[PDB]
Amino acid sequence: PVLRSVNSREPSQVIFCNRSPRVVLPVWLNFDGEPQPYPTLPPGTGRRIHSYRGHLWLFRDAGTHDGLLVNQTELFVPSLNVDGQPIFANITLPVYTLKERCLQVVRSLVKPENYRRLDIVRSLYEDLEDHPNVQKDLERLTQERIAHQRM
Amino acid sequence: LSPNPPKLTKQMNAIIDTVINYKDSSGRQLSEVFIQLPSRKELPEYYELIRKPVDFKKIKERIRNHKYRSLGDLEKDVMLLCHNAQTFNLEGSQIYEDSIVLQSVFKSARQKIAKE
């Protein structure tokens, strides 16, 4: 699997900084590429945590699983701690598309049994039903990594 | 409670240090994950399945407190750690295979100490 944590021996102190209004779910990809949920971060909170150089991290909304940014990108990889100093991982909201932002609002106000009762275009029902998840984005981020590695 | 003969304590430490400082053919320190048990608030399912939990820190603590009165008492606690590891973790997983090698290293370290 392209997206996985390498069997790193180098320990890395990270500052997980939640600069977002969402409860953050930190996601560690293990050595097989499998997503592992870590303790959640309330909005405006920071945790000093122990990780490893070359380990893979993803950040999601803990209640909805919406994708989040970390240092302006989707994947977080701890680097070298210059003179013990920790690595700063700034977790923010991405600039969601207006369509995605809208889907998040409708999902938060309507229970799934009532999606089909909304006066919207037939296709938008399937868009509401297609909830964000780590695994869907893992496939897309795999292709982007391969394309980068090839160039 | 009271200290065991110093030869016995020295023998216990030599075996445990060999097991803890051990590097497998791949060059990895296998003891690393078995040093400290997972936190009860981190993995509660461990303390639910494992009735008698033990780690290398608890074993080293029992040597210095003179809780083990023989190399057998020490062996029983190392066999228990490896058994607990082989019970909680799935067969074929790296941690499971690591406990097999450590259990074998103990038997080799014990036999080398008995030969001296």
Binding site: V110, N114, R117, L118, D119 | -
Partner: protein, 99 residues
Amino acid sequence: MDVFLMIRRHKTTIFTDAKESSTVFELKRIVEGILKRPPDEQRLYKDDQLLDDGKTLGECGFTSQTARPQAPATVGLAFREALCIEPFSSPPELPDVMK
């Protein structure tokens, strides 16, 4: 500091940005570029109060905290005519499944 504005004149809305340090006269120049009316033919308003050309937007009450990209501050505009802000269309009644 950047301010985000919504200039309103009857059924016309201009979405633009400026500095807190920029003048009313300067904002009028942006309006001049778009609507092709000189600054002398323009009248700018904040909460229905007329604004002097020489004043900065910050002095008028437009601050970065209240003039956001996603919630722009309203600027009243009238030409050489009463200041008229025509209401927009209304959303339908909220569905029972969204209540």
